Amino acid sequence: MSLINTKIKPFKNQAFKNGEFIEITEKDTEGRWSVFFFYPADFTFVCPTELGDVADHYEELQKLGVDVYAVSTDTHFTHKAWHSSSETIAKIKYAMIGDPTGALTRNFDNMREDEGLADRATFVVDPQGIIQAIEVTAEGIGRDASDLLRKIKAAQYVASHPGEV
Amino acid sequence: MSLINTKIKPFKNQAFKNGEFIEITEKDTEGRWSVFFFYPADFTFVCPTELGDVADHYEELQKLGVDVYAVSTDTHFTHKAWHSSSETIAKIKYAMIGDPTGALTRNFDNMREDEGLADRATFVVDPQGIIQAIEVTAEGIGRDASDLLRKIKAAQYVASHPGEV
Amino acid sequence: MSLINTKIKPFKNQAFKNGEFIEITEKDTEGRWSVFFFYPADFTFVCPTELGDVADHYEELQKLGVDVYAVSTDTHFTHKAWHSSSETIAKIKYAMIGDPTGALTRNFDNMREDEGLADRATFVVDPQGIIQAIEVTAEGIGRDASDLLRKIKAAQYVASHPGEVCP
Amino acid sequence: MSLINTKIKPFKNQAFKNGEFIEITEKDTEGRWSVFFFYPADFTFVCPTELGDVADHYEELQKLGVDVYAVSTDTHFTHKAWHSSSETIAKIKYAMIGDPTGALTRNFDNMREDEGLADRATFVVDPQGIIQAIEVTAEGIGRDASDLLRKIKAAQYVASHPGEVCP
Amino acid sequence: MSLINTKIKPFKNQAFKNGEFIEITEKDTEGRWSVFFFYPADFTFVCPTELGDVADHYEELQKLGVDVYAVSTDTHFTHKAWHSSSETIAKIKYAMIGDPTGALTRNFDNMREDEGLADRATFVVDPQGIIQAIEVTAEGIGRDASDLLRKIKAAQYVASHPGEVC
Amino acid sequence: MSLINTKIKPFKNQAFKNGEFIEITEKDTEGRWSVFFFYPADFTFVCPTELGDVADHYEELQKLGVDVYAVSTDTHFTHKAWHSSSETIAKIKYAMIGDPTGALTRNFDNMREDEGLADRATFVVDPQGIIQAIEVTAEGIGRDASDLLRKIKAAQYVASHPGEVCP
Amino acid sequence: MSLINTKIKPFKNQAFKNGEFIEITEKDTEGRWSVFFFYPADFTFVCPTELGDVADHYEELQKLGVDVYAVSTDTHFTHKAWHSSSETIAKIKYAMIGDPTGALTRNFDNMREDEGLADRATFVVDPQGIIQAIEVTAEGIGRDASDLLRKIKAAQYVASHPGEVCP
Amino acid sequence: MSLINTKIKPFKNQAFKNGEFIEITEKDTEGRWSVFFFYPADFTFVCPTELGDVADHYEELQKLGVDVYAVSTDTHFTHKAWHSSSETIAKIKYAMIGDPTGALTRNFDNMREDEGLADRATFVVDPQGIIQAIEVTAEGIGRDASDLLRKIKAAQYVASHPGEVC
Amino acid sequence: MSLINTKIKPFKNQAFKNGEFIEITEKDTEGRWSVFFFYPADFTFVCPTELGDVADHYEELQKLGVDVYAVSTDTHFTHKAWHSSSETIAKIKYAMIGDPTGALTRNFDNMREDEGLADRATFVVDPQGIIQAIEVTAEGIGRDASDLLRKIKAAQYVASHPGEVCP
Amino acid sequence: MSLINTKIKPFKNQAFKNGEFIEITEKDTEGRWSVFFFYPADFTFVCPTELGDVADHYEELQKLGVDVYAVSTDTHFTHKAWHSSSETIAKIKYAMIGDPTGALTRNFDNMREDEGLADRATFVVDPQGIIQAIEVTAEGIGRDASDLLRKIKAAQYVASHPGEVCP
């Protein structure tokens, strides 16, 4: 059974956001468009072009009323260090959630059970909590932020206008 | 458990391809890059911009050595009629698979069990049979063919060069 | 476990009738004689002589107080397209139900599980919902509408005169 | 889970035919067209027009290479007595199978479980054993043999010459 | 797991009695001694000596306040035909129950599953519904009606005079 | 499920016979007619008319090649005492089996579970081990040995002469 | 799991006592010291020295307020016969319980399952129903009534005088 | 579900015997009469009359070819301390087994689960390993060694002279 | 599933303290710092340096408001005898708990299942009942009380003043 | 179910050591003294005094023939970053294992299931693989490396002189 068009499960995770630690839950996503951006690990040799691309469009997403949540199995302590260490990660101003339990990752059925890391997946959730769009990729295959931006605009248009030609 | 990075299951489905009925199986996908394009139904009032967009890039995909498989719960008899009826569907020259049993749709966990139709999903499969990229969307939210094209080129680059910076 | 002389199971399917879509249920059948006409698929190369033959007698069936329900595993969107495409299907004035779930087909135990299509079966249901006549045929074997009419008239005769047969 | 286009299940029943008892199995039906004719009970007040109709066409069915098997839940001993009793049943020259177990009746899914009798169903089986036509009716609703004969000729035509007919 | 000294299960069966069809249930057996006489089938070549014997003793049984119920897997329509056909069955004044479902036969655990016919068994049921005597035999083995009559008289004596210690 | 026309289950019980103890098994019943005579208990106040009646016919039964086995849930030690105690039981020359475990009683489905005693049942078994006749009665209802003797002669006749049809 | 220091399970058995039958239950043991004396069978060739030894001390046990219950898997009818038969058993004035169902024997976990008889066990139960002493032996090994009497006096002493510490 | 007439389960336990530690197993009991004497605990205020009685009769038991094994849930280290401490326990010449695991106690179904101590029970085991006599009592109830001695002699007589019918 | 940072499970054990027996439960540890000190057995040849070390620091622990509980699988009766026997154990003024059930030992997951003795483990529990420090060693490896004392002072400091220390 | 004196379970984890990644298994530990040092997370604000204190004594441990294994639930990619970031972690010359699965942490029963991080535990393993010493502490309570060294030397002394303690 697919996760498309289903309500997101509850959670409690700590996160790093613009130099301050915070706690996000499913309560925070209510009445807001949410974007859960899963990625495997921090401090990897792979280019963080995907996270940096979303950082560029984050001003645009905030104007649409869309929150962004970068998720990974590393701790939020690690996210703070990787923000200060890397130049590309310094650009992001959205919440970077840590999921050492893996609970939030397993809610979206997105766990590499052998590696203990999250697969590369992007989810789009409406104010009601229902998942409207999913995108999963293998390693080395990037996901485009401008493509994501179009999918969100389409989702907001459908919620506004049911049954268009 | 996710379908990402798993081998595709076996199948036997009839299909319509450039004016001729044919039978495709998992044997045909072996040694070839395959793209399974799921969509709910034929003769709907919704614009088939997604199928028409892939038709434009089909010349380009064939040069990369990539086969395309449009899948739906309607019969292959219905696919022939919709090819002759519609102008946008007349453009496609790839196989349009019919899945009235739903077996091929349920192999990819992509069934609307209430409606008896397939969800809007796109899959990318390598010559080995392993799924490298997944994209699922709700109705009204289109998927971009140029975005898909980039994800395939990336997948072929990774298969060629393991462990790039 | 014969399916004859049993009350029809409840259902909720979308259908196409006279250029507009409608929702049909078991609530619509009660209080009226119903005829569920199953066929495997739309846009098949085999002729719809059976479907067109019922369309000719539909004026007589409506006069008798009998509704007709053409059922198939295709969508109602296809039923609209196949109505405009073919001449024989353009004669159809009754509802053409779509059953992509197969639920309505499985209620009558009439599903080809391998193919995922309905078998060629015709059922006659009284106002109470009880099935009084069944006719199932293989591919290529035609179902006569004139014989169907005779069975309907016989069923209505027995309903009007219960236990008054063969003296 | 329809019985149409499926191979018949094996059986072993006693039967009465032309003044002597015989044992009939699924092996007797092999390589030959068979017609299983079910009816509820013997010595009923209902007129056996359906049994008599097939008896008239039996000479014509034997020319087509078609065997007929009348089946009921009564014993083969009972069938012999009903042959000597009624003048309509005296016309019967085909085998009258007794099915007190109900096994043969339940193989065709044609048992009135609460009554312990078979329903009025007619089946057409090809030499391969595959069921090509089914016809079930309620009490009082007659099954005409002329339509059955037409269905058999159609079935034999499709088996002989696949790839037809109308486009 | 025996069937002796147990209350009979409820049932609904059609039967033929003196040129007329009737419906018997467990309600009809209440407040009366009953005798369920199972036999395999009608119109068989085997001698109907067993049913003919009970027909002779039926006058005696009706005096004792005992009803007789001949049960079989054949229909009640056949019982009527077999009554007019045979001269031995013409002596039958008691009810001939038809059990095509087999439910009544299955209540007494007396069914040949592979044959679909009832085994030749005899049961004696008191007014309370409790089974007091059981007799089962194989094909060709005769059941004596005079011995049955003796058992019924003994059953009625014990019910009337319980705890008489010899 | 009926026990008529079924092979007896295997057993190993201790028994008292003719002033000495012996062990009886299903091996002893092979190739011989056997009669299993169940009764509830020893030293009861009820008159043992049933056991004494069989003892009178035991001389005749041995000429027919028939063994008798009186079974009960009491010990074989108790049977020896009851043989010496009562004058009616002193007539018995056949084996008196004790079944304190109740295994042999439960093989014939003849146990009063709440009481822990056997019901009054009599079984006739042929040399093959198949049960040909069953007779069960309630307390106070006597079982006739003359009728039992008659049933055995009928059983031996049918075994020797299969399928006798009377003219 | 040990049965020592546990409340006895409920039961309802028929027993022979002093020339007449009676029904014993767990209700009868309430508010009184009880002694359950198990032995395998009646009319055995083994000398009943154990039962006769308790009969000698029964006069003394009744002064202590102690009831005795001789239990066995034989019927109470058999106990009456064995009371009249043997001279050693004629001494017994306490209740001789019969347990053909074996329920009371299995309450004390004292059944030879393969044999269908009780083992040689003796239990001492206080007014509360709690088991204070257990004594089990094999065949041929005698149980002393004098030692049993001593154990009861010790049990009554401890019940009256809890936690006695010797200086 | 009784423990009478059943072969003893195998075991491995440390024990104290005559100022020296030893390891006893089921192998040591083979070909010899054994007496497993369970008691709850060491250093208790209750009188050790039961163990003292067996110590007096131990010479008699060794003549009969009978070994004695005093078992308890305490360690064998404590048994040594309790041997030197008390004067009644100083009479003990037989082995004092320690069973802190409780395995040997659980083999005889003789454990107070909530207390974690063994119930006061006595067992008599023949050379074959079969249990011939069992005796269990509650706290404060004395076990007689002279009666135990009588049972052992009776057990040896029956083994020697089986089927002597009086 | 670590025991660190978890509330201790409830118990009820007998113990010896200053020449008299007492019952200790989880309720006695409430509102007070507790130290559960496990060791395998009494009267062992191994030198009790670890027991003696804590006895020297017990006066210092009582000032900090810390109770000490020496635990083993031996009985509380045994602990009394070992107190009078050894001169090192004579220094003990804290409670010596006996755990013959092993329940208290198994609550801390500290049982040598094959030996039936406790392992050499030391636990530190706060007034809330939460375990703040664990230390387990093998046979021969000593646990020093000076390090334990330091760990307790650190635990009391963190409880008093959260938010430390080094960045 | 104490974890002391048990053979360590097999594992396969990635690790960081001296600026390069390596794979460590139970195969690497056998034949050598090993020390598994668990800590909850990298880049925590709390000081790594415990981790730096072991780095000071690592020259002495390598001389004693002892390997050190720092374990945590973070990736080995973070261990490399935290090595370059902090001064105290730059002193680390031994392997720092990553355990994102938590498998290695769950082998030692040292997982905070709520937080998904390892508890502060230190284990000492001999060449045979048997665990000889365990030390677990809460957050804020320091683990002394000088005390750890003493336990190691004690474990090696007992291994060299088995059963030669405390005379």
JSON list of N, CA and C in Angstrom, two decimals, chain G residues 40 109-115 117-121 136-141, chain H residues 1-9 33 108 123-126 128-135 155 158-159:
[
{"chain": "G", "resi": 40, "resn": "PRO", "atom": "N", "xyz": [-4.77, -48.36, 44.82]},
{"chain": "G", "resi": 40, "resn": "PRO", "atom": "CA", "xyz": [-5.03, -48.61, 43.40]},
{"chain": "G", "resi": 40, "resn": "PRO", "atom": "C", "xyz": [-6.36, -49.28, 43.07]},
{"chain": "G", "resi": 109, "resn": "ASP", "atom": "N", "xyz": [-3.17, -35.13, 41.67]},
{"chain": "G", "resi": 109, "resn": "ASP", "atom": "CA", "xyz": [-2.11, -35.55, 40.75]},
{"chain": "G", "resi": 109, "resn": "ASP", "atom": "C", "xyz": [-1.56, -36.92, 41.15]},
{"chain": "G", "resi": 110, "resn": "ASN", "atom": "N", "xyz": [-2.44, -37.93, 41.12]},
{"chain": "G", "resi": 110, "resn": "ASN", "atom": "CA", "xyz": [-2.13, -39.25, 41.66]},
{"chain": "G", "resi": 110, "resn": "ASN", "atom": "C", "xyz": [-2.69, -40.39, 40.81]},
{"chain": "G", "resi": 111, "resn": "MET", "atom": "N", "xyz": [-2.65, -40.21, 39.49]},
{"chain": "G", "resi": 111, "resn": "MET", "atom": "CA", "xyz": [-3.24, -41.18, 38.56]},
{"chain": "G", "resi": 111, "resn": "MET", "atom": "C", "xyz": [-2.16, -41.89, 37.74]},
{"chain": "G", "resi": 112, "resn": "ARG", "atom": "N", "xyz": [-2.20, -43.22, 37.73]},
{"chain": "G", "resi": 112, "resn": "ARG", "atom": "CA", "xyz": [-1.41, -44.01, 36.79]},
{"chain": "G", "resi": 112, "resn": "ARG", "atom": "C", "xyz": [-2.16, -44.00, 35.46]},
{"chain": "G", "resi": 113, "resn": "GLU", "atom": "N", "xyz": [-1.79, -43.07, 34.58]},
{"chain": "G", "resi": 113, "resn": "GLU", "atom": "CA", "xyz": [-2.54, -42.83, 33.34]},
{"chain": "G", "resi": 113, "resn": "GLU", "atom": "C", "xyz": [-2.62, -44.06, 32.44]},
{"chain": "G", "resi": 114, "resn": "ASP", "atom": "N", "xyz": [-1.50, -44.77, 32.30]},
{"chain": "G", "resi": 114, "resn": "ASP", "atom": "CA", "xyz": [-1.46, -45.99, 31.48]},
{"chain": "G", "resi": 114, "resn": "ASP", "atom": "C", "xyz": [-2.22, -47.16, 32.12]},
{"chain": "G", "resi": 115, "resn": "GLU", "atom": "N", "xyz": [-2.31, -47.17, 33.45]},
{"chain": "G", "resi": 115, "resn": "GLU", "atom": "CA", "xyz": [-2.95, -48.27, 34.18]},
{"chain": "G", "resi": 115, "resn": "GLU", "atom": "C", "xyz": [-4.43, -47.98, 34.46]},
{"chain": "G", "resi": 117, "resn": "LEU", "atom": "N", "xyz": [-5.47, -46.51, 37.25]},
{"chain": "G", "resi": 117, "resn": "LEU", "atom": "CA", "xyz": [-5.65, -46.69, 38.69]},
{"chain": "G", "resi": 117, "resn": "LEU", "atom": "C", "xyz": [-4.89, -45.61, 39.46]},
{"chain": "G", "resi": 118, "resn": "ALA", "atom": "N", "xyz": [-5.26, -45.41, 40.72]},
{"chain": "G", "resi": 118, "resn": "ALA", "atom": "CA", "xyz": [-4.60, -44.42, 41.57]},
{"chain": "G", "resi": 118, "resn": "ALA", "atom": "C", "xyz": [-3.30, -44.97, 42.15]},
{"chain": "G", "resi": 119, "resn": "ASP", "atom": "N", "xyz": [-2.34, -44.09, 42.40]},
{"chain": "G", "resi": 119, "resn": "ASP", "atom": "CA", "xyz": [-1.11, -44.46, 43.09]},
{"chain": "G", "resi": 119, "resn": "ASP", "atom": "C", "xyz": [-1.36, -44.51, 44.59]},
{"chain": "G", "resi": 120, "resn": "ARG", "atom": "N", "xyz": [-0.44, -45.14, 45.32]},
{"chain": "G", "resi": 120, "resn": "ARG", "atom": "CA", "xyz": [-0.56, -45.26, 46.77]},
{"chain": "G", "resi": 120, "resn": "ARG", "atom": "C", "xyz": [-0.09, -43.97, 47.44]},
{"chain": "G", "resi": 121, "resn": "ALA", "atom": "N", "xyz": [-1.02, -43.03, 47.62]},
{"chain": "G", "resi": 121, "resn": "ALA", "atom": "CA", "xyz": [-0.71, -41.75, 48.24]},
{"chain": "G", "resi": 121, "resn": "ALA", "atom": "C", "xyz": [-1.65, -41.44, 49.40]},
{"chain": "G", "resi": 136, "resn": "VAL", "atom": "N", "xyz": [3.66, -40.70, 49.52]},
{"chain": "G", "resi": 136, "resn": "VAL", "atom": "CA", "xyz": [3.44, -41.58, 48.37]},
{"chain": "G", "resi": 136, "resn": "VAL", "atom": "C", "xyz": [4.46, -42.72, 48.38]},
{"chain": "G", "resi": 137, "resn": "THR", "atom": "N", "xyz": [4.00, -43.93, 48.05]},
{"chain": "G", "resi": 137, "resn": "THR", "atom": "CA", "xyz": [4.85, -45.11, 48.01]},
{"chain": "G", "resi": 137, "resn": "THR", "atom": "C", "xyz": [4.55, -45.97, 46.79]},
{"chain": "G", "resi": 138, "resn": "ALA", "atom": "N", "xyz": [5.49, -46.85, 46.44]},
{"chain": "G", "resi": 138, "resn": "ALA", "atom": "CA", "xyz": [5.31, -47.79, 45.33]},
{"chain": "G", "resi": 138, "resn": "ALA", "atom": "C", "xyz": [4.59, -49.05, 45.81]},
{"chain": "G", "resi": 139, "resn": "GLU", "atom": "N", "xyz": [4.27, -49.94, 44.87]},
{"chain": "G", "resi": 139, "resn": "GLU", "atom": "CA", "xyz": [3.59, -51.20, 45.20]},
{"chain": "G", "resi": 139, "resn": "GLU", "atom": "C", "xyz": [4.48, -52.08, 46.07]},
{"chain": "G", "resi": 140, "resn": "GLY", "atom": "N", "xyz": [3.90, -52.60, 47.15]},
{"chain": "G", "resi": 140, "resn": "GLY", "atom": "CA", "xyz": [4.63, -53.47, 48.08]},
{"chain": "G", "resi": 140, "resn": "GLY", "atom": "C", "xyz": [5.21, -52.75, 49.29]},
{"chain": "G", "resi": 141, "resn": "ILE", "atom": "N", "xyz": [5.28, -51.42, 49.22]},
{"chain": "G", "resi": 141, "resn": "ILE", "atom": "CA", "xyz": [5.83, -50.61, 50.31]},
{"chain": "G", "resi": 141, "resn": "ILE", "atom": "C", "xyz": [4.69, -50.11, 51.19]},
{"chain": "H", "resi": 1, "resn": "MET", "atom": "N", "xyz": [0.00, -37.06, 36.98]},
{"chain": "H", "resi": 1, "resn": "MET", "atom": "CA", "xyz": [1.21, -36.19, 36.92]},
{"chain": "H", "resi": 1, "resn": "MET", "atom": "C", "xyz": [2.12, -36.39, 38.14]},
{"chain": "H", "resi": 2, "resn": "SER", "atom": "N", "xyz": [2.08, -37.59, 38.72]},
{"chain": "H", "resi": 2, "resn": "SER", "atom": "CA", "xyz": [2.81, -37.87, 39.96]},
{"chain": "H", "resi": 2, "resn": "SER", "atom": "C", "xyz": [4.30, -38.09, 39.69]},
{"chain": "H", "resi": 3, "resn": "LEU", "atom": "N", "xyz": [5.09, -38.02, 40.76]},
{"chain": "H", "resi": 3, "resn": "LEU", "atom": "CA", "xyz": [6.54, -38.22, 40.67]},
{"chain": "H", "resi": 3, "resn": "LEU", "atom": "C", "xyz": [6.96, -39.61, 41.15]},
{"chain": "H", "resi": 4, "resn": "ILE", "atom": "N", "xyz": [6.00, -40.40, 41.63]},
{"chain": "H", "resi": 4, "resn": "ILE", "atom": "CA", "xyz": [6.26, -41.76, 42.10]},
{"chain": "H", "resi": 4, "resn": "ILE", "atom": "C", "xyz": [6.52, -42.69, 40.91]},
{"chain": "H", "resi": 5, "resn": "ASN", "atom": "N", "xyz": [7.45, -43.62, 41.10]},
{"chain": "H", "resi": 5, "resn": "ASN", "atom": "CA", "xyz": [7.76, -44.65, 40.10]},
{"chain": "H", "resi": 5, "resn": "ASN", "atom": "C", "xyz": [8.29, -44.04, 38.79]},
{"chain": "H", "resi": 6, "resn": "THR", "atom": "N", "xyz": [9.17, -43.04, 38.92]},
{"chain": "H", "resi": 6, "resn": "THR", "atom": "CA", "xyz": [9.75, -42.34, 37.78]},
{"chain": "H", "resi": 6, "resn": "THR", "atom": "C", "xyz": [11.26, -42.23, 37.97]},
{"chain": "H", "resi": 7, "resn": "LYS", "atom": "N", "xyz": [12.01, -42.29, 36.87]},
{"chain": "H", "resi": 7, "resn": "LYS", "atom": "CA", "xyz": [13.47, -42.19, 36.94]},
{"chain": "H", "resi": 7, "resn": "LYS", "atom": "C", "xyz": [13.91, -40.76, 37.22]},
{"chain": "H", "resi": 8, "resn": "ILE", "atom": "N", "xyz": [14.86, -40.60, 38.14]},
{"chain": "H", "resi": 8, "resn": "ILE", "atom": "CA", "xyz": [15.34, -39.27, 38.52]},
{"chain": "H", "resi": 8, "resn": "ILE", "atom": "C", "xyz": [16.08, -38.59, 37.37]},
{"chain": "H", "resi": 9, "resn": "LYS", "atom": "N", "xyz": [15.96, -37.26, 37.30]},
{"chain": "H", "resi": 9, "resn": "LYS", "atom": "CA", "xyz": [16.59, -36.48, 36.24]},
{"chain": "H", "resi": 9, "resn": "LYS", "atom": "C", "xyz": [18.08, -36.28, 36.54]},
{"chain": "H", "resi": 33, "resn": "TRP", "atom": "N", "xyz": [21.24, -47.58, 46.32]},
{"chain": "H", "resi": 33, "resn": "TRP", "atom": "CA", "xyz": [20.05, -46.95, 46.91]},
{"chain": "H", "resi": 33, "resn": "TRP", "atom": "C", "xyz": [20.41, -45.55, 47.41]},
{"chain": "H", "resi": 108, "resn": "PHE", "atom": "N", "xyz": [12.76, -32.53, 41.41]},
{"chain": "H", "resi": 108, "resn": "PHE", "atom": "CA", "xyz": [11.85, -33.27, 42.29]},
{"chain": "H", "resi": 108, "resn": "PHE", "atom": "C", "xyz": [10.53, -32.53, 42.55]},
{"chain": "H", "resi": 123, "resn": "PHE", "atom": "N", "xyz": [12.93, -38.39, 49.61]},
{"chain": "H", "resi": 123, "resn": "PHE", "atom": "CA", "xyz": [12.76, -39.29, 48.47]},
{"chain": "H", "resi": 123, "resn": "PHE", "atom": "C", "xyz": [13.66, -40.51, 48.60]},
{"chain": "H", "resi": 124, "resn": "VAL", "atom": "N", "xyz": [13.15, -41.67, 48.18]},
{"chain": "H", "resi": 124, "resn": "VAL", "atom": "CA", "xyz": [13.90, -42.92, 48.20]},
{"chain": "H", "resi": 124, "resn": "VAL", "atom": "C", "xyz": [14.04, -43.43, 46.77]},
{"chain": "H", "resi": 125, "resn": "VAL", "atom": "N", "xyz": [15.28, -43.54, 46.30]},
{"chain": "H", "resi": 125, "resn": "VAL", "atom": "CA", "xyz": [15.57, -43.92, 44.91]},
{"chain": "H", "resi": 125, "resn": "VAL", "atom": "C", "xyz": [16.35, -45.23, 44.87]},
{"chain": "H", "resi": 126, "resn": "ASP", "atom": "N", "xyz": [15.88, -46.18, 44.07]},
{"chain": "H", "resi": 126, "resn": "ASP", "atom": "CA", "xyz": [16.53, -47.49, 43.94]},
{"chain": "H", "resi": 126, "resn": "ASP", "atom": "C", "xyz": [17.75, -47.41, 43.01]},
{"chain": "H", "resi": 128, "resn": "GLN", "atom": "N", "xyz": [18.24, -48.53, 40.10]},
{"chain": "H", "resi": 128, "resn": "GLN", "atom": "CA", "xyz": [17.83, -48.24, 38.72]},
{"chain": "H", "resi": 128, "resn": "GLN", "atom": "C", "xyz": [17.52, -46.76, 38.49]},
{"chain": "H", "resi": 129, "resn": "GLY", "atom": "N", "xyz": [17.29, -46.02, 39.58]},
{"chain": "H", "resi": 129, "resn": "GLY", "atom": "CA", "xyz": [17.00, -44.59, 39.51]},
{"chain": "H", "resi": 129, "resn": "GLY", "atom": "C", "xyz": [15.52, -44.26, 39.70]},
{"chain": "H", "resi": 130, "resn": "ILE", "atom": "N", "xyz": [14.70, -45.29, 39.89]},
{"chain": "H", "resi": 130, "resn": "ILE", "atom": "CA", "xyz": [13.26, -45.12, 40.02]},
{"chain": "H", "resi": 130, "resn": "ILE", "atom": "C", "xyz": [12.90, -44.72, 41.45]},
{"chain": "H", "resi": 131, "resn": "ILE", "atom": "N", "xyz": [12.03, -43.73, 41.59]},
{"chain": "H", "resi": 131, "resn": "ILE", "atom": "CA", "xyz": [11.61, -43.25, 42.91]},
{"chain": "H", "resi": 131, "resn": "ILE", "atom": "C", "xyz": [10.56, -44.19, 43.49]},
{"chain": "H", "resi": 132, "resn": "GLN", "atom": "N", "xyz": [10.86, -44.78, 44.64]},
{"chain": "H", "resi": 132, "resn": "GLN", "atom": "CA", "xyz": [10.00, -45.78, 45.26]},
{"chain": "H", "resi": 132, "resn": "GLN", "atom": "C", "xyz": [9.13, -45.22, 46.39]},
{"chain": "H", "resi": 133, "resn": "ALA", "atom": "N", "xyz": [9.60, -44.17, 47.06]},
{"chain": "H", "resi": 133, "resn": "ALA", "atom": "CA", "xyz": [8.86, -43.57, 48.17]},
{"chain": "H", "resi": 133, "resn": "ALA", "atom": "C", "xyz": [9.06, -42.06, 48.24]},
{"chain": "H", "resi": 134, "resn": "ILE", "atom": "N", "xyz": [7.97, -41.34, 48.48]},
{"chain": "H", "resi": 134, "resn": "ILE", "atom": "CA", "xyz": [7.99, -39.88, 48.62]},
{"chain": "H", "resi": 134, "resn": "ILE", "atom": "C", "xyz": [7.32, -39.49, 49.93]},
{"chain": "H", "resi": 135, "resn": "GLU", "atom": "N", "xyz": [7.88, -38.49, 50.60]},
{"chain": "H", "resi": 135, "resn": "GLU", "atom": "CA", "xyz": [7.32, -37.95, 51.84]},
{"chain": "H", "resi": 135, "resn": "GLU", "atom": "C", "xyz": [7.52, -36.45, 51.85]},
{"chain": "H", "resi": 155, "resn": "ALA", "atom": "N", "xyz": [11.15, -51.53, 50.67]},
{"chain": "H", "resi": 155, "resn": "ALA", "atom": "CA", "xyz": [11.47, -51.31, 49.26]},
{"chain": "H", "resi": 155, "resn": "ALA", "atom": "C", "xyz": [12.51, -52.32, 48.76]},
{"chain": "H", "resi": 158, "resn": "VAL", "atom": "N", "xyz": [10.81, -55.89, 48.40]},
{"chain": "H", "resi": 158, "resn": "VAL", "atom": "CA", "xyz": [9.97, -56.02, 47.21]},
{"chain": "H", "resi": 158, "resn": "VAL", "atom": "C", "xyz": [10.82, -56.18, 45.95]},
{"chain": "H", "resi": 159, "resn": "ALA", "atom": "N", "xyz": [11.92, -55.43, 45.89]},
{"chain": "H", "resi": 159, "resn": "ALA", "atom": "CA", "xyz": [12.87, -55.53, 44.78]},
{"chain": "H", "resi": 159, "resn": "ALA", "atom": "C", "xyz": [13.51, -56.91, 44.72]}
]
